[PDB]
Every structure is written in structure tokens, then in C-alpha cells.
């Protein structure tokens, strides 16, 4: 069904979908790989400017995403795509009929996992090679050792070991020998998230319920655990800027910063993402920075900042709350109506079903802004008849706009859903 | 960053070092007793002589300053300077001045303390090295000229902006500015650090205690309109009252009692948090006035809580610790007190708790019911679980005497309750 | 010949020695195993002088190969150099009424 006149290029107004992003660095610059449907994007992090896009649309949606230094590892329907700057340049077909569920990179051993608990270990063709092309071995965790695979982690200072966190326990596999070298104890709560701590041999397991348990694989022992009931831990990250702090992003769109040394709650952040779209679908600290990237399923990718402590003596006791810093976002619904704004093909207004209308930039998307819904004051000075609380306007079923006299009076007319009247808008 | 901010940061690095005779003069005229001219034209040996005399007088008062006259008040303490030493040593010096101020924080209106603090200001430059700690030490004395001089000579951290407005004035700072300082949130975290330190060192007294307790009642007072600010105020102030009750002192226990009382009558709290407050109060309750004020906190807490599960009974551990720490005769005397506060939900819940657990002091329950005036739904709950306890337990003479008291006063509710549950 | 104690005090007085005060100041304050192993990872022995990161990891100029045990030991040591071990994990482990019930309820309830 390919065309001779046109050719698909990319998508505007979408920064996330619910798929967790992956962070990476090229020395000092940091880039973020976030999936957009059948495609992924690569943003900058110091400015959130766009770096790369996937040039080739994968025939399905990318399920798993990860990244080392200069190679991005996607997993759509059955294969691992290894791209460089978004350029489709290696495909890695697994030998299954299942769908690739998990994916992780460590050294000379790629570890994928298809949904029938089937781990695929691939070896690099050379130590100087850049991506795995050779199929090393194929492991599978049957139902007796543990539950379904929750995570494929690679803990620091472990010779070819892979932490298969399952639903019931934690397994350690030597991918060189293909052998399960350690089975952990069974945990009474189904693990949903696993994240390696900056301390040695210790993982955090955020289960169905609020119980971030600091488990040590050496002792085979749950050293610690943090109570945080009625909440599904959807992300865990560690402050690596120089302070013992943990961010727990629940599925309720919430974000909780704990200080571990005082064993206290530094801070809470309510409704940073929308629960119906999953809430906080991914939260990651910047490595060695007090900057936190929080992506939700609501087509939102925020980047908050911690300020340094203002107390001259206390510091981490009187530590600063998060300050709102730079974010990217778009519609939560598909766009209903669209319009261009000028002849230069530089801006497009987009009205969607979430009653929020957005001017997206076109050259570089750093100008994706919601049009302000804030009333001008009436000329008669009388009262306005309406509810005390605020709400957005109905979905835009008709629209017109001109640019003859722009910045002079109104230039957009929007006929909303089932109104005997049409609202005006200044671009 | 901008070069102005970089040079300002390196100036804050190079603050306490004198780079010329004028800046040396400014830091030498920075004093606590003398004015600028004589503070210029006097000498470290004179100030140290008066300082050693002042600190040996303080040693005569209490034996705590002997170690500081041994270490921080020596000829080496004269000949030493801060910038010529290393970071480990300057940290140990900060700890030593911290211990000294935590000891001398309770004699601020005394001239030997003024002289010793002035010598430490002009020698160890504490008024530019640790300012937050010094202000948290002598903050309770804001109506004093010694604190006014502290203000007029201090370089202020960026949090005390009310005192930055009130600096270099002839009037002492105000109670409103105190309410605003304690209304700032991170100042309360600095004060939680201070309260943790002074609780761990047991250097507390009634003036500072009453002062910051009044600041807390007035901040929750001005904040009685904003629910989210009150809710974010819950953890700090509750940790304060928790460690204040963990402390053994009766004054700190009564101050924490007042704090929980005002926070409950400003904020309808939760049942499990309220019962944990009763648990901690009952665990660290030791003295007589603490017991009386704690009984008042029990009554006020159980009255201010209202909802589904309003008059639910006390559990096993809580009720058993309640009868262990309190006497039926003491609470009977409290009911016989003429003031008669509204202990309605507490008394009903306590009677239903005894009816579940003990089933022995039915005479005591009878005296309670005839001493305090009750309310219709509470007596309804009493008649229901009393009918249930009469059906499980053997029919007792004092039990039917309670029933006959109900006949004398409102048999009709007993009739309605039996028609709903029974014959 | 060792010096006398009076001569040492006079030498402190004539020199301006702050070492005794430094000792008092630094002294006086506030007086009021594994569960599993791997035999292949034990018998493994890796080269050292192939890559610059292991050229950092080594300890001897002449040593070119070391076993997996000493390799992972130096690896965890340089991991310690990168990230120091903090107190909440190094020295903290969880494993009449109580007094910290408010603290526990405050940690568990928002």
C-alpha cells in the first residue's frame, strides 16, 4: 500500500504513551528514548530538545526499550531492533512464536524474555563489536523456580549473572554457563518493579502493595523495607547526586521522596500523572543530578529539579522540596480537529477530546503549549453566570482561523460540541 | 552561572577572613556588649581575662562550664585562628561551640554569659560562622536588648527575613513576626533538628518551651483556614509532639499535650492516629500533673473525633494500659470535679470497653452513669451491648440494677432496643 | 634526652602550640558472608592489561592475569570508590505500650 507521491515522516504532539523511557549519556549530554507507538523518540535532557527519531516505523508497537552508550535496543512484536540515532540498522529475530516481553544489555550478553518465561541470551560477535548478532543460548524459567518474569536486571560486579525477578522470588542466572546460580526466598507480595540500588548487591522490589523492600543477594536477606499501603509501586529510583534518597512513583500518579538515613518522608507529589492512563508509568533520576524525569501514560514526560539545601548547618534535614522544571507533553486523547497557524508551516493548533487545545510547534517541538483558558474581563463590568469552580470547553467540532490582522483582535473561532454559540480565541 | 553570583559565592567563602585593616576593624568592632569605638580600642587579652572570669563564675554556678574553661577558654584558644586550621578541626570547633551554646542557652539574661558569648563572638566569629544555631538558641528572648544587639550585629541567613526587616531598629521584634517565622515551613525543620538535639542532650527549660509551644498554637491558629497547609503541617508537628512525649520531662509532656489538643481541635484527626497518641501518652505517662493533663487530652481527643466508628470501644492493649496507668477512683474524682468537661464519647466508649473486657466493676460503671450526663445515641449503644452482655453472661444482680436504673431513667429506650433486638 | 614536663608546658607557652587544644577539641563532645557462590566464577581467571579500565583495576605492573575472586574484589573496591556505602544500609537493618507508634503511622499514612 506504499505511495509514490507522499511518504510518512513523523508524529507531532506526543512525548510518551505509558511505555517506560530509557536514559542514556554520550559523555556529558543526556538523551531519553521514549516510545511513541510503533516508533521511538530521542530527546535531549539539558533542554528537552529533540535529538533523534526512529526513521523506520516498526510493523508493530515497540514493547520494550533500553539503551547503552550509542545503541538503542527496541523490542516490538517478535524481534530486537538495534538502532543507532534512530536509524534502523540491525534486526535480531528471536527463535520463538511468543512476543518479547523484557530486554536488558550487559557487556557481551543481551538478555531478552518472551512472555512464556523464555529468556534469550545473545553474545556479541566480538568484544569490539557494537551490537549482538549471534544467538548465544536460550534459557527458560519454568513455574517451579518462580513466577512470571517481572524484570531482567544486571547487578553491578557480577560475572555474567542476570537477576530474573519473577512474581514470587528473585532468580540469579549465570548466562555464561546457562545455569540458575541462586534462588531467593519467596516473597509474600507479588513484585511489580525491581531496581538495582547504588549500594552493592541490593535491589528494590516495589510490589503490588506499598513495601519497597531493600533485598541483598549476598546475605539472601531482606535488609530493609518501606511501608506505603494502598499503592502499587510503579517506579523506584535513587538519588545519585550525593544523597540517600529514594523516589517511589506509584500508579496513582504520585511521587514520594524518602530520606533513607533518617528513615523519613522528604516529600510527596500528588497527581504528576494521570491514574487512568496509568499514573507514573516511569520515574528515573538523572545519574549524579538532582533532576528527575517522570513520564506518565497521559502523554507526558516531566523533568523536575531538587534545589540544594538553604540551611547553612542542617542540609539534608532541611532539604529543599522539588521545584517545577521543564516538561514535554501532548494530548491524552487523539486529536479531534487540527489547523495550521501560518504560511511558514511552523505551528499547528490541535483540539482533542480531553477538552484541552494545544499549539504544537513544527520545526522543533519546544513550543508545544496549551492555549490558555483564562477569561478577559467583560466590558459592562457585570457578573458572569457560571459555576464557581473551573472547567474546560467542549470538544471542538468546527473551527476557523485567519492571520490578516494577527495580534490585533480575535483570530480563531471554535464551535464546540452542542453549543448554540462559538467561542473566540487569540493565537 | 553569572560572574556576579560566582564572586558573591567566593565572597561568602572569604567572609570571616580579614583582608585589610578596615575589614579587620569591622570584625573587631562586631561585639555584644561594647560599642564600636571601645570595641575597636580594646584587646583580645582584656576580653579573654573578662571571659575567663565570666566562665569561672559560670563554673561556680554549675559544673558544666569547667570543661569549656579547660578547652575553649585557654591561651591556645587565644593564639588559635579558624582559617589556619583544617576541616576536621573546624568541624570539631563547630561541635564545641554547639555544646557550649546548648549549655549556655538557659542563662541568656546573665552578664557572665554575655561576656563569654561576646568573647566567643570576637574570637571564634560565631556570629558569622554559626548564625542559625545561635538564633535558635536565644530565639525565645526576642524582647531583650541582648538579642537586639545580636540582631544588629548578625549577618542573617536567608530564612530570617522578618528579622532582616526588623534589624537595626530600636524596638524588639514582635509576636506577629514570631508567628510568621514559625509559619515558614523549613524553619520548622531547622527547629525539629534543634528539638532533636536538645531532647538528646536534656537541656530544656520552661521559657523556651512555652515560647515555641505558643508559636505552634498560633501557627495552627492562623492556618486553621487552609486544609492542605494543615495536612502538610501534620508530620512535622506530630514528630515534635512524639519526641516531646518520648522525653521524660513533665514540662515537655504537658507542652506536647497542649500541642496535640490544639492540633485536634483545629484538625479532626484519624482514629488510629488518635489511638496511637493515647498509646504513647499512656506509655510515657509518669507524673501527676502530666496524668491530669493527659486525661484532659484523652477526653478532648475522643470528643473532637467524630465519624463512622465514633464511639467504638478501646482495644485490648490500649484498654489494659488504660486501667494499668489510671485508677477508677482517680477518674471518679475527675468526674466529681466541678468544671465537668464534655467527656461524652470517651466515657461511653470506656464503659462499653469495660463491658466487653472486665465485666467486674459494674458498680463503677453504675457510678459513672449516674455521675456524668449522657446522650441519647450513647445510651442506645450502651443498652444494646448491655443486652448482649446480659445474654452471654450470667444474669447478675448489679446488671439488673443497671437495668432498673434505666427503668427509673428512660425505660422507653430499653423497650425500643429490646423490640429491635430481643423480646 | 627526653624533655621535662614543665619545659614542655613552657615550650607550648612560648611557641603558641595548639596541638593539646586540638586533641581536647577532637576528643570532647556531647558529654550530657554470602548465601551462594559460583564454581565457574571462582575458577575463572581474566586478563588485566587488555583494556584501560582494568589497567586502573589492577594492583601490580607485572601482573597480567588474576582470578575471578580477586577480580570481583577489586571490582567491588572500585565500585566502593565510585559510590561510597552510606549508613542506612551499612549500619542500619530492620530485621505496656511503645513510643514510636506515631512515627510508624506517620510513615505508613499520608
Amino acid at each position: 500500500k506504499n505511495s509514490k507521491i507522499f511518504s510518512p515522516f513523523r508524529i507531532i504532539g506526543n512525548v510518551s504513551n505509558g511505555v517506560p523511557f530509557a536514559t542514556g549519556t554520550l559523555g556529558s549530554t543526556f538523551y531519553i528514548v521514549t516510545c511513541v507507538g510503533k516508533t521511538f523518540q530521542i530527546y535531549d535532557a539539558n533542554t528537552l530538545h529533540l535529538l533523534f527519531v526512529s526513521e523506520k516505523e516498526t510493523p508493530s508497537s515497540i514493547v520494550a526499550l533500553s539503551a547503552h552508550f550509542h545503541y538503542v535496543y527496541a523490542a516490538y512484536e517478535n524481534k530486537v531492533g538495534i538502532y543507532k540515532r534512530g536509524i534502523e540498522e540491525h534486526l535480531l529475530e528471536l527463535e520463538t512464536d511468543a512476543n518479547v516481553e523484557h530486554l536488558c544489555i550487559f557487556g557481551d550478553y543481551l538478555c531478552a524474555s518472551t512472555d512464556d518465561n523464555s529468556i534469550f541470551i545473545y553474545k556479541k560477535s566480538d568484544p569490539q563489536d557494537k551490537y549482538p548478532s549471534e544467538f548465544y543460548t536460550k534459557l527458560t524459567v519454568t513455574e517451579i523456580q518462580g513466577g512470571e518474569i517481572v524484570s531482567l536486571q544486571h547487578l553491578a560486579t557480577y560475572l555474567n549473572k542476570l537477576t530474573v525477578v519473577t512474581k514470587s522470588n528473585v532468580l540469579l542466572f549465570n548466562v555464561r554457563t546457562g545455569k540458575l546460580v541462586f534462588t531467593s526466598n519467596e516473597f509474600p507480595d507479588q513484585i511489580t518493579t525491581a531496581e538495582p540500588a547504588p549500594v552493592l548487591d541490593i535491589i528494590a522490589l516495589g510490589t503490588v502493595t506499598g513495601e519497597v523492600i531493600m533485598f541483598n543477594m549476598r546475605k539472601g536477606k531482606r535488609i530493609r523495607t518501606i511501608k506505603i499501603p494502598q499503592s502499587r509501586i510503579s517506579s523506584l529510583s535513587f538519588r545519585t547526586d550525593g544523597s540517600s534518597h529514594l523516589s517511589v512513583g506509584t500508579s496513582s500518579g504520585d511521587l514520594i521522596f524518602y530520606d533513607l538515613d533518617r528513615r523519613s518522608r522528604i516529600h510527596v507529589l500528588k497527581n504528576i500523572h494521570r491514574e487512568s492512563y496509568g499514573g507514573v508509568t516511569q520515574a528515573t533520576f538523572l545519574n549524579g543530578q538532582p533532576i528527575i524525569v517522570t513520564s506518565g501514560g497521559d502523554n507526558s514526560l516531566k523533568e523536575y529539579v531538587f534545589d540544594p539545601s538553604l540551611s547553612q548547618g542542617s542540609g539534608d534535614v532541611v532539604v529543599q522540596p522539588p521545584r517545577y522544571l521543564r516538561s514535554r507533553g501532548g494530548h491524552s486523547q487523539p486529536p479531534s480537529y487540527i489547523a495550521f497557524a501560518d504560511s511558514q508551516s511552523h505551528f499547528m493548533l490541535s483540539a482533542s477530546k480531553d477538552r484541552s487545545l494545544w499549539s504544537f510547534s513544527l520545526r522543533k517541538d519546544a513550543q508545544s503549549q496549551e492555549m490558555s483558558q483564562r477569561l478577559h474581563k467583560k466590558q459592562d463590568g457585570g457578573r458572569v453566570g457560571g459555576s464557581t469552580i473551573k472547567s474546560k470547553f467542549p470538544e471542538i467540532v468546527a473551527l476557523a482561523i485567519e492571520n490578516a490582522r494577527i495580534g490585533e483582535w480575535e483570530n480563531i473561532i471554535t464551535a464546540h460540541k452542542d453549543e448554540k454559540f462559538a467561542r473566540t480565541w487569540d493565537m | 552561572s553569572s560572574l556576579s553570583d560566582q564572586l558573591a559565592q567566593v565572597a561568602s567563602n572569604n567572609a570571616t577572613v580579614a583582608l585589610d585593616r578596615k575589614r579587620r576593624q569591622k570584625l573587631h568592632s562586631a561585639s555584644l556588649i561594647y560599642n564600636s569605638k571601645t570595641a575597636a580600642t580594646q584587646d583580645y587579652d582584656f576580653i579573654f581575662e573578662n571571659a575567663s572570669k565570666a566562665l569561672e563564675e559560670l563554673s561556680q554556678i554549675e559544673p558544666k562550664f569547667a570543661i569549656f574553661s579547660r578547652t575553649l577558654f585557654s591561651e591556645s584558644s587565644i593564639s588559635l585562628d579558624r582559617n589556619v586550621q583544617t576541616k576536621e578541626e573546624i568541624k570539631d570547633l563547630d561541635n564545641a561551640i554547639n555544646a557550649y551554646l546548648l549549655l549556655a542557652s538557659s542563662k541568656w539574661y546573665l552578664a557572665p554569659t554575655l561576656h563569654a558569648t561576646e568573647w566567643l563572638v570576637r574570637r571564634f566569629q560565631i556570629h558569622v560562622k554559626n548564625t542559625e544555631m545561635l538564633l535558635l538558641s536565644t530565639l525565645n528572648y526576642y524582647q531583650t536588648p541582648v538579642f537586639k544587639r545580636i540582631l544588629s550585629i548578625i549577618k542573617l541567613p536567608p530564612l530570617f527575613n522578618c528579622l532582616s526587616n526588623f534589624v537595626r531598629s530600636e524596638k524588639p521584634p514582635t509576636a506577629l513576626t514570631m508567628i510568621k517565622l514559625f509559619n515558614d515551613m523549613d524553619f520548622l525543620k531547622l527547629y525539629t533538628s534543634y528539638l532533636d538535639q536538645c531532647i538528646k542532650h536534656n537541656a530544656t527549660y520552661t521559657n523556651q518551651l512555652l515560647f515555641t509551644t505558643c508559636c505552634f498554637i498560633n501557627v495552627v491558629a492562623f492556618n486553621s483556614n487552609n486544609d492542605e497547609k494543615l495536612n502538610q503541617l501534620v508530620p512535622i508537628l506530630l514528630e515534635i509532639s512524639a519526641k516531646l512525649l518520648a522525653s521524660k520531662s513533665k514540662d515537655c509532656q504537658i507542652a506536647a499535650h497542649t500541642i496535640l489538643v490544639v492540633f485536634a481541635t483545629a484538625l479532626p484527626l484519624k482514629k488510629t492516629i488518635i489511638l496511637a497518641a493515647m498509646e504513647t501518652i499512656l506509655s510515657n505517662l509518669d507524673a501527676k500533673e502530666a496524668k491530669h493533663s493527659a486525661l484532659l487530652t484523652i477526653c478532648k481527643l475522643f470528643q473532637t473525633l467524630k465519624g463512622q466508628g465514633n464511639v467504638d470501644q478501646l482495644p485490648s492493649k490500649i484498654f489494659k494500659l488504660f486501667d494499668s496507668k489510671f485508677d477508677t477512683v482517680s477518674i471518679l474524682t475527675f468526674l466529681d470535679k466541678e468544671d465537668k468537661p464534655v467527656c461524652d464519647k470517651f466515657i461511653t466508649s470506656y464503659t462499653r470497653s469495660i463491658a466487653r473486657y472486665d465485666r467486674s466493676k459494674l458498680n463503677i460503671i453504675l457510678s459513672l452513669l449516674k455521675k456524668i450526663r449522657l446522650e441519647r445515641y450513647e445510651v442506645r449503644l450502651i443498652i444494646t451491648d448491655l443486652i448482649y452482655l446480659s445474654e452471654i453472661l450470667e444474669d447478675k444482680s448489679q446488671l439488673v440494677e443497671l437495668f432498673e436504673y434505666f427503668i427509673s431513667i428512660n425505660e422507653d429506650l430499653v423497650l425500643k432496643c429490646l423490640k429491635s433486638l430481643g423480646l | 634526652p627526653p624533655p621535662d614536663e614543665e619545659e614542655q608546658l613552657l615550650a607550648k607557652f612560648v611557641f603558641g602550640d595548639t596541638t593539646d587544644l586540638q586533641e581536647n577539641l577532637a576528643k570532647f563532645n556531647a558529654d550530657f558472608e554470602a548465601a551462594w557462590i559460583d564454581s565457574d566464577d571462582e575458577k575463572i581467571k581474566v586478563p588485566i592489561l587488555v583494556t584501560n579500565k582494568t589497567k586502573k583495576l589492577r594492583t601490580s605492573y607485572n601482573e597480567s592475569k588474576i582470578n575471578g575472586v580477586h577480580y570481583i574484589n577489586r571490582l567491588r573496591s572500585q565500585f566502593e570508590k565510585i559510590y561510597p556505602r552510606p549508613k542506612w544500609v551499612d549500619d542500619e537493618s530492620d530485621s505496656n505500650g511503645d513510643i514510636n507508634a506515631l512515627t510508624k503511622i506517620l510513615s505508613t499514612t499520608y
Binding site: T25, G27, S28, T29, F30, A45, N46, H68, I105, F106, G107, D108, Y109, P127, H154, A156, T157, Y158, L159, N160, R176, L286, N287, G288, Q289, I291, V305, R323, L325 | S1, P158, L159, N161, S164, N165, K180, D184, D186 | D40, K43, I44, K45, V46, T51, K53, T54, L57, L75, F79, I82
Partner: peptide, 28 residues
């Protein structure tokens, strides 16, 4: 005057990381 919280610019400094290529080694 109340306590000012003037915002400021941020900068992502150079970050150090671990080498999984150093962790994963070939067998003897």
C-alpha cells in the same frame, strides 16, 4: 518580606558510570 524562592537555571554536569562490558567477561 516573606522568604523568597527565586528559581534559577540548571546544568547537567558530567556523570560517571559503570561498564557492563567490564562486568561481562569472556571465559578462561
Amino acid at each position: 518580606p516573606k522568604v523568597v524562592r527565586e528559581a534559577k537555571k540548571v546544568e547537567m554536569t558530567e556523570a560517571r558510570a559503570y561498564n557492563a562490558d567490564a562486568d561481562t567477561a569472556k571465559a578462561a
